[PDB]
Ligand binder design. Structure first.
Ligand code: ANP
Ligand code: ANP
Ligand code: MG
Ligand code: MG
Ligand code: MG
Ligand code: MG
Lengths: 387, 392
């Protein structure tokens, strides 16, 4: 009997617990680690706004994860809603301070869902906040607030979010250290003044497993890192910026004797690992710049076909970092940046700055074009040899 | 700065479809070409879901001149009756997020729709929406202007059942509001392949600057050979290496799988993955389960027949999948898709399942057809040694 009785409306966090995949992709290792990503993003968002300097993540013994920032602290006062803003932010969907650019000019967070999902997919969530001249505490048991508590007075500011992933939701709740270590590192690469500390408290003087991430050389350091094991082909690491009405691009790149593509893209510090408009404008601009150089330096005949992106990006270590005041991310996992205006923006920046670099550095330009030409001709030889 | 004085007032709660209008990327990916087409997917997906349940036989998609899209199914009809919340059910289904009849397995046992978001999002990102429902003994008509319902109208009596949804994309939302016929065509074609008793008709009533009948693009997709008509389609411009196509299925608790595969002359991998008819073009567990199974099956066959030497390492997936045309269709009672755009299927248990079915059933095909198998193994053996030669 398909009718009005079959239509079911979901309320609050019901929808998150019924369809975790809509918010975290899946309940696998990727989904589990996304919980950490949601809590850390909010702390990073505070650093980007220029309030936090430090983000400390701790993998606790019990499987709990702690994330502490020295930012402004989650608004704790009573909302217009009639409940303390901590609860609005922690238990409601499409609720937050990132629907404008007033509180956070450039922020990874934008849907007002992130940390609410973490509450929804956790057995427990604790929060310790410093602001309004006090130390504030709140416990959320099976997503429900047990009571906001006004504690010790303090001039200090910041937030500390603690959460315990539901073993009913996730199959495996053991977080992976090096997965977390890798992501926190890239956040510090995209945030110059930011310091991220990581501690693994899970199982006479004893030192606990820890890492510190501070990179004053930003993206140029990120590239040096990518090209440690890989043997760099040219001395000068490409580095440039681009500014526009509503957006900004930051690029750094270097080639190596490798045969793989090591291109990482970011939008408001978010790892847009499935790419997007920013990556697309970059690839587009790169292919056209190299192809013009090779044709102009007669490294390819006029009858010779143009070098494909695959030939050029082979052995390339590149980082594309965009700061967008109004991003368009593909779902809550934000695997892609979709902003159509950002493709034409990145493209003109890469076109004008890569054309500049290739003409300014003739030594370095020669090598990377020689590689592209040699890798292109190799694929034309391998296809013919196979017949 | 007012950023310093950030507190309770800085936090704002979005009500209903304001969430979709503010952050469309959460539900459609982007406001680009791919996002625009996603609006048709949401509406067609709902019509297809009715075919999957065995109530709809036909789906008719029309790209209107004005710029609107019309999707007509002969299903059961979007329930019209006044919902428990106090308003007609159509209005709940069209103006409210996380509301639908796909949260259980009662109305739709297997369905691509699962979030209760689809058609509400379409309504949210459209200047106007129009619904024509035939059910409960009468033909009904509702109109939404900027998502707001103008009032449900009751019409003439009918014994027939179906739904007709018509939407006009908001140009303020989308950079481009003009659809690509081939994009729509290709998709509706794959939908017809994965649903044996379904017929999808696409019609293009958009003119170009007289109105001769041949100037209107049209398609009618009905494939009784399902996935086999799909692999036959894939290897058309390409040339098959073995005569008979690999056709096999396999069921489990709360999941079913269908595989159809064939190898071509090229070095081009053409593996298409589907979950509840949804094109999971980024793959997921079902694909990964198949990829694992396929690599293991060929490596056990190449070693036993001694086609591959003991000295050389095992074959890579890429060399096996080189020139492979395959279709992977899973039917899952409780799926887990990455977001609204549903680009990936992430069910942990599906990787084990598809691999279990593939490992067992492919081994069966290799053992029963040694003649066709030798050609396949010989292709992978040469392409692996080609990859080794290229590295030198
Ligand atoms: N560590 C924090 N410091 C200060 N404010 C925070 C912090 N964490 C959360 N908030 C506030 O709570 C709001 C909502 O967070 P959240 O639930 O993650 O959604 P969001 O960050 O706005 N967007 P999104 O992450 O894309 O879903 C934020 O806008 C912040 O204002
Ligand atoms: N053509 C139709 N025929 C009958 N019922 C429909 C039709 N279209 C929508 N519905 C019903 O309306 C509900 C809401 O639609 P929708 O917004 O697309 O959410 P959904 O299909 O459940 N899931 P999803 O598409 O993944 O967000 C559906 O679940 C159906 O119950
Ligand atoms: Mg913002
Ligand atoms: Mg957030
Ligand atoms: Mg019917
Ligand atoms: Mg739908």
């Amino acid at each position: 009997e398909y009718g009005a009785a079959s239509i079911t409306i979901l309320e609050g966090l019901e929808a998150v617990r019924k369809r975790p995949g809509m918010y975290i992709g899946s309940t696998g290792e990727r989904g589990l680690h996304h919980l950490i990503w949601e809590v850390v993003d909010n702390a990073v968002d505070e650093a980007m706004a220029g309030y936090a300097t430090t983000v400390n993540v701790v993998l606790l013994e019990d499987g709990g994860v702690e994330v502490a920032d020295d930012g402004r602290g989650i608004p704790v006062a009573t909302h217009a809603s009639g409940i303390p803003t901590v609860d609005v932010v922690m238990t409601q969907l499409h609720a937050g301070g990132k629907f404008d650019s007033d509180a956070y000019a450039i922020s990874g967070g934008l849907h007002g869902v992130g940390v609410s999902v973490v509450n929804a997919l956790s057995t427990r969530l604790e929060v310790e906040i410093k602001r309004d001249g006090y130390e504030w505490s709140q416990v959320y048991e099976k997503s429900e607030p047990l009571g906001l508590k006004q504690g010790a007075p303090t001039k200090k500011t910041g937030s500390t979010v603690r959460f315990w992933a539901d073993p009913a939701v996730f199959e495996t709740t053991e977080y992976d250290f090096e997965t977390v270590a890798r992501r926190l590192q890239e956040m510090a690469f995209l945030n110059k003044g930011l310091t991220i500390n990581l501690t693994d408290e899970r199982v006479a003087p004893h030192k606990v497993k820890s890492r510190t991430f501070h990179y004053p050389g930003g993206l140029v350091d990120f590239v040096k890192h990518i090209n440690r094991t890989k043997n760099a082909i040219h001395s000068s690491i490409v580095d440039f910026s681009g500014k526009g009405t509503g957006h900004e691009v930051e690029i750094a790149m270097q080639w190596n004797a490798g045969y793989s593509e090591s291109v990482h893209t970011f939008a408001n510090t978010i790892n847009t690992h499935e790419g997007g408009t920013h990556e697309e404008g970059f690839r587009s601009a790169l292919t056209s710049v190299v192809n013009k150089y090779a044709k102009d330096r007669k490294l390819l005949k006029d009858k010779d076909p143009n070098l494909t992106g695959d030939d050029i990006r082979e052995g390339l270590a590149a980082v594309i970092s965009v700061k967008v005041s109004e991003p368009q991310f593909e779902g809550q996992t934000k695997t892609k940046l979709g902003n159509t205006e950002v493709k034409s923006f990145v493209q003109k920046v890469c076109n004008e700055q890569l054309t500049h670099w290739f003409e300014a550095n003739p030594t370095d330009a020669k090598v990377v074009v020689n590689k592209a030409v040699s890798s292109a001709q190799a694929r034309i030889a391998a296809r013919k040899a196979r017949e």
